[PDB]
């Protein structure tokens, strides 16, 4: 998949759902998302 080869911003962190699927954890908003903020940003 169109992942994002690079360090996450000052709040996000990569993780996985055990099964193997990798998700993103936002420490600023306190949420999640399989998407990478690096992909969709401004």
């Amino acid at each position: 998949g169109p992942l994002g080869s690079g360090p996450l911003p000052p709040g996000w962190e990569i993780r996985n759902t055990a099964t193997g699927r990798v998700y993103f954890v936002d420490h600023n908003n306190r949420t999640t998302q399989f998407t990478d903020p690096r992909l969709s940003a401004n």
Binding site: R15, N16, T17, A18, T19, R21, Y23, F24, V25, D26, H27, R30, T31, T32, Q33, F34, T35
Partner: peptide, 20 residues
Amino acid sequence: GPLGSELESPPPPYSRYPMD
């Protein structure tokens, strides 16, 4: 009506650690 959408729901909860 080919309503097809993947992901955008499965991502576990925030919390902090990696927990499905």
